[PDB]
XYZ file of C-alpha atoms in Angstrom:
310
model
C -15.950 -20.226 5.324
C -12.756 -21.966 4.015
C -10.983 -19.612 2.824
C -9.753 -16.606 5.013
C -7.749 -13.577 4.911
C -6.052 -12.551 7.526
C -3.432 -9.893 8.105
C -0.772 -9.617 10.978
C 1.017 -6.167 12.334
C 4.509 -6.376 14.135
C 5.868 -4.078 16.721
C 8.225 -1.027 15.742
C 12.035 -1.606 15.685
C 13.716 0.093 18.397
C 15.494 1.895 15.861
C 12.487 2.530 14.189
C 11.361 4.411 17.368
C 14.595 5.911 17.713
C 14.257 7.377 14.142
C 10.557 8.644 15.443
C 7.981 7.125 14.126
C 4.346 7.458 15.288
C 1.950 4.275 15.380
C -0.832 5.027 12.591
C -2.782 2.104 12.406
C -5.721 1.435 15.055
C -7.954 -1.735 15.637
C -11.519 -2.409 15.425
C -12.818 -5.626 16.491
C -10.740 -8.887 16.065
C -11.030 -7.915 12.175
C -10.862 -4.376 11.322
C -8.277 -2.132 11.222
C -7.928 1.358 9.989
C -5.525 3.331 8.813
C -5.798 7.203 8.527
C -10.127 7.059 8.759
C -9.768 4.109 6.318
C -11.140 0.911 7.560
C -9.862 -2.700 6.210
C -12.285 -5.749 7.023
C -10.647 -9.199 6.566
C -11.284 -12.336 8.558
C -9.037 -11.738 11.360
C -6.452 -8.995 12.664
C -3.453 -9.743 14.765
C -2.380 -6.852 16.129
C 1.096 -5.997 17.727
C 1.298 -7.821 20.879
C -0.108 -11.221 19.149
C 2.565 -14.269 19.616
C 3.586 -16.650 16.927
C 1.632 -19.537 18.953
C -1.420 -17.754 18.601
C -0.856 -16.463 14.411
C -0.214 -20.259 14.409
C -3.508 -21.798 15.766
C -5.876 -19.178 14.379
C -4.006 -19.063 10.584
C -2.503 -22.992 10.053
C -3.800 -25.624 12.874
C -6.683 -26.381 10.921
C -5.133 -26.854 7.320
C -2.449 -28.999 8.795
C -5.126 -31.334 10.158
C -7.142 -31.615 7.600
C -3.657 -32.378 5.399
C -3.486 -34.958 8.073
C -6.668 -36.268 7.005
C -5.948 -36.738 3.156
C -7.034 -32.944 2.555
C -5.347 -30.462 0.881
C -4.338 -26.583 1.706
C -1.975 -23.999 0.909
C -0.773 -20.942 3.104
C -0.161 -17.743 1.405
C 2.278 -15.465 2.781
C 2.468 -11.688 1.303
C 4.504 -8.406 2.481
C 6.764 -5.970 2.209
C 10.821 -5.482 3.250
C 10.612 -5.702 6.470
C 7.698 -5.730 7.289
C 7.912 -9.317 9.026
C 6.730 -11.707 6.590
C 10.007 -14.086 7.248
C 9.412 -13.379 11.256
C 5.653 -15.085 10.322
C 6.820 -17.848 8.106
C 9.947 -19.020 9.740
C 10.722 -17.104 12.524
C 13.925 -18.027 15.059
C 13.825 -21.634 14.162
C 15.449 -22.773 17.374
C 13.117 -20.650 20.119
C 10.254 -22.581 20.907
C 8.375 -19.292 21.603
C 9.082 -17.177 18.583
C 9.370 -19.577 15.882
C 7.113 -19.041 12.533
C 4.583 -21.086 11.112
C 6.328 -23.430 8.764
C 8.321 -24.886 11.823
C 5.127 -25.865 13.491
C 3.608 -27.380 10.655
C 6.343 -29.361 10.434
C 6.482 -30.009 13.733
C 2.718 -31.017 14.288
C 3.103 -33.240 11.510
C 5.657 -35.040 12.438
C 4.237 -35.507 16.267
C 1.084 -36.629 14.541
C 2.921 -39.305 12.599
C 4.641 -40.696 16.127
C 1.608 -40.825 17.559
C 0.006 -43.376 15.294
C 0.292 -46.852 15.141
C 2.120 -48.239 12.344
C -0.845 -49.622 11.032
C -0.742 -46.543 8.768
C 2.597 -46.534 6.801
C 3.380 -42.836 6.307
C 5.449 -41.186 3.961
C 6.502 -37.498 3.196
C 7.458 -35.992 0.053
C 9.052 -32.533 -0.631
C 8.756 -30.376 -3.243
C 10.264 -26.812 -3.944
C 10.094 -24.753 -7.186
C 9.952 -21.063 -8.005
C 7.747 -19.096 -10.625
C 10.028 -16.782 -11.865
C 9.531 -14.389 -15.130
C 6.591 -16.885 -15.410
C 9.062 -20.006 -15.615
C 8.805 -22.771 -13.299
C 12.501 -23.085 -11.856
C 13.128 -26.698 -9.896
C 14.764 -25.440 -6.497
C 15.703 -28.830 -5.901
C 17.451 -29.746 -8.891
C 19.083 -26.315 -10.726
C 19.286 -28.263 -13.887
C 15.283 -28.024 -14.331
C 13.950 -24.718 -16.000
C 11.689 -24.436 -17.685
C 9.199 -27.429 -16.214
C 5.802 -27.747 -17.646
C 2.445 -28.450 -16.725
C 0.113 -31.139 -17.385
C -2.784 -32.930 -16.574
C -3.552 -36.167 -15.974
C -6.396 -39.115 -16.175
C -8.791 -36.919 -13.455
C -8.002 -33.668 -15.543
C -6.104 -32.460 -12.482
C -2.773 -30.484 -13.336
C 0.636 -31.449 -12.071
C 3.805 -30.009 -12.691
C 5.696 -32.811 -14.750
C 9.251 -33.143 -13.703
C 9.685 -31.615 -10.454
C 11.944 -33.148 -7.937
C 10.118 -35.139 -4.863
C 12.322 -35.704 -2.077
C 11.270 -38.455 1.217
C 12.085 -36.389 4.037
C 12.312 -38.539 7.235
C 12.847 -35.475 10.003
C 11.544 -32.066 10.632
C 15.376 -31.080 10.249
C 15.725 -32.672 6.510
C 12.336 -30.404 5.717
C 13.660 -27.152 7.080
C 17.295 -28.281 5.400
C 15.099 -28.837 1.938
C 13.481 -25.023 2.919
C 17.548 -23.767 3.410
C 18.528 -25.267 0.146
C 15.629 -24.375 -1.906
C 16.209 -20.606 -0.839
C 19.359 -21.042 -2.189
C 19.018 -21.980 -5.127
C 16.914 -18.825 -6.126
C 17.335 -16.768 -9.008
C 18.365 -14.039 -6.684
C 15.840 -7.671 4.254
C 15.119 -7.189 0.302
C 13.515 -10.011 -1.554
C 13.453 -11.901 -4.969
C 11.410 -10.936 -7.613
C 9.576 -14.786 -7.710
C 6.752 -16.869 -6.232
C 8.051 -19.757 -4.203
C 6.130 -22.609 -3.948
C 7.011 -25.418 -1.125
C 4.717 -29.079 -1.312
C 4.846 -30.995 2.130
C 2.758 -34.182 1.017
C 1.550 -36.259 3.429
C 1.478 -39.975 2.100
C -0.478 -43.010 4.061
C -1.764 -46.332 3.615
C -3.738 -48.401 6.171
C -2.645 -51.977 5.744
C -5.245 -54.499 5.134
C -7.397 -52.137 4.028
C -4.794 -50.819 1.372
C -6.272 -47.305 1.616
C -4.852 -44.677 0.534
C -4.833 -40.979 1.351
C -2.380 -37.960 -0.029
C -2.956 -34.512 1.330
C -0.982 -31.885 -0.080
C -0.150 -28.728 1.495
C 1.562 -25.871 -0.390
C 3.352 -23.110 1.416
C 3.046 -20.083 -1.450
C 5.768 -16.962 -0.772
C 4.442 -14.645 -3.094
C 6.318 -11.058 -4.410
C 4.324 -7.899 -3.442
C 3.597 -5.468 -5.813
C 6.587 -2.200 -4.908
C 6.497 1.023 -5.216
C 8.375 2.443 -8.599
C 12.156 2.964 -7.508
C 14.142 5.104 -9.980
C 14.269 0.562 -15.649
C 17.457 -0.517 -15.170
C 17.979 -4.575 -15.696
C 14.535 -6.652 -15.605
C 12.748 -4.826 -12.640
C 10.338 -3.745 -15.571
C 9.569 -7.487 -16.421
C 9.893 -8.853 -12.822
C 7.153 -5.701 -12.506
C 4.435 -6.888 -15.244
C 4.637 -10.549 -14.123
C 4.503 -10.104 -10.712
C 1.136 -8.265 -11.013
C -0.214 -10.304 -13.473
C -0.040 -12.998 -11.238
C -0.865 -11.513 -8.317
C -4.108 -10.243 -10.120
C -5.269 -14.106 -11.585
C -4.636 -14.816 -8.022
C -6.640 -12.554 -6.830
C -9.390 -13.631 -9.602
C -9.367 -16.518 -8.163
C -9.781 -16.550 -4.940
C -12.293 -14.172 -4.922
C -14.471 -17.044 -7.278
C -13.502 -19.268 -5.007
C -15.064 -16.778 -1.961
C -17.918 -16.401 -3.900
C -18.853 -19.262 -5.074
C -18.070 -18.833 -9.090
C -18.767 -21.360 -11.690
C -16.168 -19.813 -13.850
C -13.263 -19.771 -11.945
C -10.193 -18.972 -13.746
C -7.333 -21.428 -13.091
C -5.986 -20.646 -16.336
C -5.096 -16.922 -16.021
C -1.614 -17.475 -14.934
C 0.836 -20.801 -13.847
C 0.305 -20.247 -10.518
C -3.245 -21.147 -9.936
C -3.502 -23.939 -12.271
C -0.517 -25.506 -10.274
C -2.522 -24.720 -7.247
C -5.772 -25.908 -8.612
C -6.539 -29.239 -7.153
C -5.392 -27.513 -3.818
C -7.525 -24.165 -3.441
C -11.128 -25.678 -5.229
C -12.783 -28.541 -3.495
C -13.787 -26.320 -0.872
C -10.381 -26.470 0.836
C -8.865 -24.451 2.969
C -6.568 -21.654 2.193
C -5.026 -18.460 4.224
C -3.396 -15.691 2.960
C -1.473 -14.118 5.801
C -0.585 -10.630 4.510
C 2.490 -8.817 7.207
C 2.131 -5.081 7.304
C 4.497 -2.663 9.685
C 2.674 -0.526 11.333
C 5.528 2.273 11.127
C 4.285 5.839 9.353
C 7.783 5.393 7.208
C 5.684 2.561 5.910
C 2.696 4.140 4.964
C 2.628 3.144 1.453
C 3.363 0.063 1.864
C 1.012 -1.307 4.225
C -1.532 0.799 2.352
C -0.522 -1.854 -0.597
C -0.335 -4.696 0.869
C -4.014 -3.885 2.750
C -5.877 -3.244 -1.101
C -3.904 -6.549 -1.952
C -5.555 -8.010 1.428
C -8.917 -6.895 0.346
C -8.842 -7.754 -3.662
C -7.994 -10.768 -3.078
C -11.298 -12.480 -0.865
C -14.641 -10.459 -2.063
């Protein structure tokens, strides 16, 4: 089984405590948990007192080394305000113990690469855009809206025109990460699905052989409750869950085993093609607060857990 679902709980604020709220969910298992006699199955539970190592080598250690090895695989990362989705992904970049998961990857990478002989020339290319009101906004070059997709000799589709930066350092790569965050269309979050490419370039010498594995870091918007029409929440609303739903489509063909899977429902998953068929490996890590104040929420993002695999 290649593609998993997992989902990860945090422990309360100490102002969330201090406000008084009462832990509702409970754990079955590595893989069930329940909320008010409701069960949700998925491929693996982290519960509260789980450290970022550990999220790390059960959700990520495999897809980086199988990008290592000319694969591809993307990361999905889904939640709420709060409900420490950033904490997952990123994390205190400068504590060795409680940094996220992108850090690591780009850490293990780059250990891999000084490991190896040079034998095998290696290269490493960024890439960071934004699907935003369905348009595919460059966030390393603000000049490029609009960007298109195509496909090329092998049918595979590519999105022409986005910048590719060499990145040399696991600094430049989490600089790239600042920068692209920047640059979005605008602890609450955007209305867009940010998309971050790490490709892994090498070529063994006399043997010119070549390998690229690509492996796409996906921050997705969750689908929020209805707050009091006013500007383009409406819109951000209707895209946002028509994505999420192809996406959804498709990884549950995908889980299954579907002939007819449906790249073409949205942008998203025909970027994201190449890199979730092929029997590659993908994880959706979906964050959920265990807090009662957050109820709702984690009820949401646990039915988005479950539509999407099966």
């Amino acid at each position: 089984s290649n593609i998993k679902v997992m989902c990860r709980f945090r422990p309360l604020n100490e102002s969330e405590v201090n406000r008084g709220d009462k832990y509702i969910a409970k754990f079955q298992g590595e893989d069930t948990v329940v909320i008010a006699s409701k069960p949700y199955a998925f491929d693996r539970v982290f519960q509260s007192s789980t450290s970022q190592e550990q999220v790390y080598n059960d959700a990520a250690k495999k897809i980086v080394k199988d990008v290592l090895e000319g694969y591809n695989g993307t990361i999905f990362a889904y939640g709420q305000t709060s409900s420490g989705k950033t904490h997952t992904m990123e994390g205190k970049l400068h504590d060795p113990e409680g940094m996220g998961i992108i850090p690591r990857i780009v850490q293990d990478i780059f250990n891999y690469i000084y490991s190896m002989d040079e034998n095998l020339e290696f290269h490493i290319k960024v890439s960071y855009f934004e699907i935003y009101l369905d348009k595919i906004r460059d966030l390393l070059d603000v000049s490029k809206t609009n960007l298109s997709v195509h496909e090329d000799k092998n049918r595979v589709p590519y999105v022409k025109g986005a910048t590719e930066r060499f990145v040399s350092s696991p600094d430049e790569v989490m600089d790239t990460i600042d920068e692209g965050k920047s640059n979005r269309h605008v602890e609450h979050s955007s209305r867009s699905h940010s998309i971050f490419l790490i490709n892994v370039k090498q070529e063994n010498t006399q043997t010119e052989q070549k390998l690229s594995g690509k492996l796409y870091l996906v921050d997705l918007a969750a689908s929020e409750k209805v707050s009091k029409a006013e500007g383009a929440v409406l819109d951000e609303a209707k895209n946002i869950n028509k994505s999420l739903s192809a996406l959804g489509n498709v990884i549950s063909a995908l889980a299954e085993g579907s002939t007819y899977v449906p790249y073409r429902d949205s942008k998203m998953t025909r970027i994201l093609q190449d890199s979730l068929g092929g029997n590659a490996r993908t994880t959706i890590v979906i964050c959920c607060s265990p807090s009662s104040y957050n109820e709702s929420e984690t009820k949401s993002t646990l039915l988005f857990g479950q539509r999407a695999k099966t």
